[PDB]
Amino acid sequence: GIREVILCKDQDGKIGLRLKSVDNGIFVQLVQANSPASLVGLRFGDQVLQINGENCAGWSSDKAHKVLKQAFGEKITMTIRDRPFERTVTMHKDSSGHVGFIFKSGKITSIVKDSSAARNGLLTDHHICEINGQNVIGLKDAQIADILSTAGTVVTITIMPAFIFEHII
Amino acid sequence: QGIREVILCKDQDGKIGLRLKSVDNGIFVQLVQANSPASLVGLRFGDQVLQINGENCAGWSSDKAHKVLKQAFITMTIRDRPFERTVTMHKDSSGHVGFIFKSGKITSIVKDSSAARNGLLTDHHICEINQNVIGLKDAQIADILSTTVVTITIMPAFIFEHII
């Protein structure tokens, strides 16, 4: 469940990352688009186990950022555990195009009876993180709706429990 | 993980061995009785039940799922432990793994350990070792641990406390 990424600092010395301490681990809080971080596949909610061979366990957000800022040379290695708090739910649009849930400020708030969401056991009080391959974090409900409505028929959403989501952010 | 269908037969007394709970408009397994039909077909604490006999459980109360099973003239479609994840560690020279717990909850990670190397988190409840471990005294969990490669299944405390 674990992999290494090698980040190459951009010409300004940056990697496009913000990290956050949660339950004595370190997690990706923000990934800048088109950054060294986005290029190597880092996502919101990824767990950083090691930076340059050193364990992040127990580090504060401030410390993880200081370690990155002072990291020498042009390359930074990180060992990563892929989105541990998230899960994947796959649904299909009814002949009507809906799938079957309501959401508010990025959070799933209702499941529609007898929908694909209900059949697939979609849960409320969970934030939608990505839709069919794309971060929806920080976007407006209206933009989220539009991405959902830009149909695919098959809709795969990745979700995190709201409690956790709210601590990472 | 995806989904799976289990086929269950009530026992000789017409029992299943399950207690269920409504959480986030889903239905979860809150208790599996030792050596029940539920246990035998592989149901575990924290499993999600998506359907019973082909009816969606979405939005059902605990009370409603129970009566449906009592009334059940049983197939269940289930998601495996979706609030949970697994971490694998390797014992120390001294036989340790590298964490401290209290009442089933991991409270600290030992620096420079396998638990640290594998990103084991605090304020998580230990659900299984492999064993199940829910309900056991700490000195008992400690025995299973002591008795090289330790895999544990953990669940964030917030969700664990709500499910029980």
Residue numbers in the entry:
A (entry chain A): 113 to 281
B (entry chain B): 112 to 184, 188 to 244, 246 to 262, 265 to 281
Paper text:
Syntenin-1, a member of the PDZ domain-containing scaffold protein family, is involved in diverse physiological processes, such as cell adhesion, protein trafficking, and transcription factor activation. Syntenin-1 is an adaptor-like molecule that contains at least four separate structural domains: An N-terminal domain, two tandem PDZ domains (PDZ1 and PDZ2), and a C-terminal region. The diverse biological functions of syntenin-1 arise from its ability to bind the cytoplasmic domains of numerous physiologically relevant signaling and adhesion molecules, including syndecans, neurexins, and ephrin B12131415. The present study provides clear evidence that syntenin-1 negatively regulates syndecan-4 signaling via binding between syndecan-4 and the syntenin-1 PDZ2 domain.
The crystal structures of syntenin-1 with and without a syndecan-4 cytoplasmic domain peptide (corresponding to the C2 region; 4C2) were determined to be 2.8 and 1.9 Å, respectively. In our structural superpositioning of syntenin-1/4C2 with syntenin-1, the overall RMSD was 1.493 Å. In the absence of syndecan-4 however, the molecular surface of PDZ2 in the syntenin-1/4C2 complex was wider than that of syntenin-1. Upon syndecan-4 binding, a structural rearrangement of the PDZ2 domain provided a specific binding pocket for the syndecan-4 cytoplasmic domain. Indeed, both pull-down assays and gel filtration chromatography showed that syntenin-1 exists as a dimer under physiological conditions. Our structural analysis showed that four residues (Q162 and A169 in PDZ1; R193 and F197 in the linker region) were involved in dimeric interactions with four PDZ2 residues (R199, N232, A230, and R231). Notably, both electrostatic and hydrophobic interactions contribute to the dimerization of syntenin-1.
